[PDB]
Structure formats: structure tokens, C-alpha cells
Ligand code: HEM
């Protein structure tokens with residue numbers, strides 16, 4: 001999908017392979033796979049198709065970006081990774097955060113998302129306001145994923161399935177609790193819970209519920225609730241696409 005992968009040195013590639021292993025162990029032990037996937041989404045997602053500036057280029061590490069109200073918790077995620085990152089000084093932060101997202105999906109039992117190295121760390125972040133609003137609906141999803149990032153309606157629904165792991169926190173976003181009964185297991189339960197209604201102890205954001213009422217998003221929700229393999233396929237496709245917005249002269 002219009003992507004040309006940069007050449008990196010044999011030493012860079014070796015660090016990638018070694019960092020991936022250390023990330024597995026670290027992330028599994030710390031139980032922070034959801035936060036790492038969220039960090040990856042944010043580090044990819046401050047991308048714009050209308051300006052082509054900022055986003056998946058080591059920019060999330062800057063304290064100017066960790067300030068935002070959609071960024072509560074992203075500071076924690078960056079901090080958790082600092083010591084590991086210091087073991088692999090050759091790797092760009094951009095690649096490191098995307099590798100962490102790929103690993104987060106993998107060690108929670110999700111699909112193996114292909115990873116290619118070579119994202120450069122850019123010197124200035126994008127503007128605050130591009131990123132997601134849980135209180136909004138389908139027009140908003142299409143604005144953040146479609147218009148800004150060039151992703152398709154299928155990507156939108158698949159990627160929303162990221163919420164199958166993790167939870168909201170009253171002190172971060174203000175929302176609270178896991179979307180699923182197994183929030184460290186990457187499966188299609190996000191979609192099953194979304195369809196089944198609101199359960200005691202389980203979260204649905206207005207942005208999740210937007211998927212149910214949209215003529216295009218809904219049949220996809222039905223498909224993924226019915227077929228985890230179809231979910232895994234489309235999820236891996238969309239995660240790779242998202243992770244690579246930071247590549248290839250866009
Ligand atoms: C569709 C637009 C989206 C909106 C409005 C949204 C909103 C939110 C909110 C409000 C939280 C809770 C933050 C907190 O209180 O800790 C959250 C958490 C999370 N998000 Fe999203 N999100 C979106 C898309 C995505 C995507 C595309 C992914 C990855 C594929 C993702 C992955 C996650 C994960 C894994 C968590 C759990 C974080 C944790 O457990 O600490 N989200 N999201």
C-alpha cells in the first residue's frame with residue numbers, strides 16, 4: 001500500500017530481533033500489553049494525510065505531547081520502556097514503540113503483525129486535537145482514521161478491536177474498566193460484548209457504540225463477532241498499515 005522500506009544496517013536488524021524478545025518478556029511480566037498497544041496507536045496516529053507532518057516519528061516521547069487529555073497514561077507507557085530502550089540505543093524510538101505494539105498483540109495471543117524497521121525520529125510533534133474523542137460517533141471515526149490516516153472503513157472496525165485488551169481509568173480518560181472479561185487476552189470478545197449489550201462491569205465508549213449503528217461498520221462488527229480468524233486477518237492487515245504511516249516518504 002504505497003510503502004518503500006528503508007535499508008537499515010545488519011547491526012540495526014540484530015538489535016530489532018533482540019529487542020523483540022526482551023519486549024515479549026518485559027511486557028508479559030509487567031502485564032502492560034494494552035498500554036503498549038495504546039502507545040503504538042498514539043505514536044502512529046498523530047499522522048495527517050492533509051499536512052503529512054508529525055506522528056509516527058519518536059514524537060510521543062516529547063513532554064509537549066504527553067500533556068494532552070487523550071495522552072493521560074502515555075507518559076507512564078514511555079516511562080516503562082525507557083530502561084529497555086536504553087539497552088538498544090541504535091533503535092529509533094519510532095521503531096521501538098511500533099515494535100512494542102506488535103509484541104503487545106503477539107504476547108496477548110493475537111495475530112503476528114509483520115514488522116519492518118527504519119522509521120526516523122522527527123524533531124517536532126504534530127498539533128494537539130487530531131486524536132480520538134470517545135464521546136463522538138461514526139463521522140469522527142472516519143475523520144481520525146479515514147481522512148487523517150488514509151485507513152479504510154474495514155481498518156476502522158478491525159483496529160477498534162484493539163480495545164479487546166485493556167481498560168479505561170477514571171484518572172486518565174475518566175472512563176473506567178475493561179471492555180472484556182479477559183482484558184489480557186487478544187480475541188474477538190470486544191465485538192461479542194459490543195453486540196450483547198452493556199454488561200455489569202464492562203465498558204463501551206460512545207465511539208465503540210458508533211460501530212453498531214453505522215451501515216458499513218455494523219456488518220463488520222457482526223463478521224468479527226462470528227469469525228475470530230477473519231478478525232485476526234483484518235486486524236493484522238490494519239495494524240501493519242497503521243504502524244507504517246511513519247515510513248516510505250508516506
Ligand atoms: C476509535 C478511536 C478511539 C478512541 C475514541 C479510543 C479511546 C480510548 C479511551 C478513552 C481509552 C481509555 C484510556 C484510559 O482511561 O486509560 C482507550 C484505551 C485503550 N485503547 Fe483506544 N481509542 C480509540 C482507538 C484505538 C485503537 C485503534 C487502538 C489500537 C488498535 C486502541 C487501543 C487501546 C488500548 C489497548 C486501550 C487500553 C489501555 C490500557 O489498558 O491502559 N484504541 N481508548
Ligand SMILES: [C-]#N
Nearest residue numbers: 038041042132
Ligand atoms: C485509545 N487511545
Ligand SMILES: [K+]
Nearest residue numbers: 164180182185
Ligand atoms: K479480550
